[PDB]
């Protein structure tokens, strides 16, 4: 359950929090992706990488030597925590989107976070953030030691993770 992801603040800190809004990163990396007009959403910048990535003293991937089964469990836990934190972020009505009985726009946010995770494992990210690049490279290394086939196999389980969180 506990993974080291804090409550979402991408569109503003939760009340009583006031500031902390994350702006759209309309920039591209020369080394990775070269020219890309896509702008990274605040939510994606705040994606709950979970145990896949620790920010201690810069950025260091936590899956340097992780088995395929372990990586699947880590991603499942990360998606579950992302769903939980997104629900508590939109339920309090702090997300700009959120200002059935689910919080308005929560399903959009969780589906889009799942899409971002899919593209993180697949390695086809439109724009690579700080956490995106190293995680993409390491996940490519782990599986190929073909990534698309792996995710096309475990997507049902990963989405079952979101359903179980809900």
């Amino acid at each position: 359950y506990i993974r080291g992801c804090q409550s979402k603040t991408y569109d503003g800190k939760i009340f009583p929090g006031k500031g902390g809004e994350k702006q759209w990163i309309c920039k591209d990396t020369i080394i990775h992706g070269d020219t890309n007009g896509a702008c990274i959403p605040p939510r994606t910048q705040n994606l709950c990488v979970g145990e896949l990535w620790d920010k201690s003293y810069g950025g260091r991937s936590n899956i340097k030597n992780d088995t395929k089964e372990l990586l699947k469990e880590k991603i499942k836990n990360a998606i579950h925590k992302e769903t939980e934190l997104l629900y508590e972020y939109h339920d309090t009505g702090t997300a700009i989107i959120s200002k059935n009985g689910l919080p308005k726009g929560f399903c959009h946010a969780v589906q889009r976070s799942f899409i971002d995770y899919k593209n993180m494992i697949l390695g086809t990210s439109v724009n690579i953030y700080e956490h995106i690049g190293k995680l993409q490279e390491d996940i490519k290394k782990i599986i190929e030691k073909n990534v698309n086939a792996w995710w096309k196999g475990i997507e049902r389980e990963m989405w079952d993770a979101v359903r179980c969180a809900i």
Partner: protein, 224 residues
């Protein structure tokens, strides 16, 4: 065949702004239609009891009886009797509680120690600890607040008071608030209202932004 009379801890008075008398029985043989009453020094019945528990399956009764009394009456320190009417006992079993006398009041000192710099480096979580020292009696109620709004009791916990190593007659309580490192590295207040009898106004608070330790006269910055 005794009765456990729980006095209202000062946290209880401060939380609900009323003095609540709760006496819990124990080690009483099983039978129905058992009644309890609360009586003060003069013996007059104070208030009928509510939220009475059903017969205890564990063979030892634990019935909760609530009686309301004037705050000043409890502050004076009279002996309030909880009379338990039990069929087996020829006379009702009586237990009484009075607040301790003496207990030289000493104002608490509320110092907030912000998170260690080596904890913020983890960039995961931080624990703002609101140290409270040099107070008596051993009853405080530390409550946290962010930006002036109360925080849910899930986020903070208060260690039980313990004797202070230096002063024998004083105690110290130690409370922490688990804050997210982003919310700390961004300027946030996280006050700490400390409720105690020895305080003049019965509550004091100290805040810790990220900028408390900052010099406030030279915003010295390092940039590549």
């Amino acid at each position: 065949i005794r009765v456990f009379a729980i006095p209202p801890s000062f946290a209880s008075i401060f939380l609900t702004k009323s003095t609540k008398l709760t006496c819990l029985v124990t080690d009483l043989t099983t039978y129905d239609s058992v009644t309890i009453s609360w009586t003060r020094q003069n013996g007059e019945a104070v208030k009928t009891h509510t939220n009475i528990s059903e017969s205890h399956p564990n063979a030892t009764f634990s019935a909760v009886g609530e009686a309301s009394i004037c705050e000043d009456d409890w502050n004076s320190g009279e002996r309030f009797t909880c009379t338990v009417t039990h069929t087996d006992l020829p006379s009702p079993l009586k237990q009484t509680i009075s607040r301790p006398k003496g207990v030289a009041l000493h104002r608490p000192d509320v110092y907030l120690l912000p998170p260690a710099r080596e904890q913020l480096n983890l960039r995961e979580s931080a624990t703002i600890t609101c140290l409270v020292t040099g107070f008596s009696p051993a009853d405080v109620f530390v409550q946290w607040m962010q930006r002036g709004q109360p925080l849910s009791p899930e986020k903070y916990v208060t260690s039980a008071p313990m004797p202070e190593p230096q002063a024998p007659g004083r105690y110290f309580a130690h409370s922490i608030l688990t804050v997210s490192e982003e919310e700390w590295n961004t300027g946030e207040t996280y006050t700490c209202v400390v409720a105690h009898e020895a305080l003049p106004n019965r509550v004091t608070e100290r805040t810790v932004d990220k900028s408390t330790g900052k010099p406030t006269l030279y915003n010295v910055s390092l940039v590549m």
